Amino acid sequence: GFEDGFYTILHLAEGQHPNSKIPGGMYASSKDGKDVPVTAEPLGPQSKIRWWIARDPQAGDDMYTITEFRIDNSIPGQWSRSPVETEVPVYLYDRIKAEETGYTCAWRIQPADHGADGVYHIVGNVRIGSTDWADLREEYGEPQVYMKPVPVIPNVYIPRWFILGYEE
């Protein structure tokens, strides 16, 4: 499946062209740091929008971790969420914080029912009749990655992202 690597993760609104030229694309970002929700920002010389995504075999089949890039000597945080609640933020937690809170850091990264290459859903909790999908909302005047519950029925737009690796 999905290859381990160093990626950018671009939020895609319905109808948005992944390769679009109009500015404004918002990428998931670690700029707010550990212990708070993951936010988003556009391209810039001081952006923090690269993530190391790797398979985590111990978490199960097809599961991955999504870990921030750092240049210091601290343990990097990872996308983390409640394994029971929906409509909650995705937090950037290191493993000791994730263990303390009981949060899960395991994600599925599944290609959209035929959408373009690079277009994926980032899947959280799956329940009968409703699955949580990572998406972007505005909270307190700022972008925030969070878990949106959406039933998998015809015509509804399931949240997705354009995930591009380091090399073309």
UniProtKB/Swiss-Prot annotation:
CDD domains: beta-trefoil_Ricin_Macrocypin (cd23716). This is Macrocypin-1a. GO terms for molecular function: cysteine-type endopeptidase inhibitor activity. It comes from the Eukaryota. Inhibits papain and cysteine cathepsin endopeptidases, and also inhibits cathepsins B and H, which exhibit both exopeptidase and endopeptidase activities. Belongs to the protease inhibitor I85 family. It comes from Macrolepiota procera (Parasol mushroom). Keywords: Protease inhibitor, Thiol protease inhibitor. Disulfide bonds: none annotated.
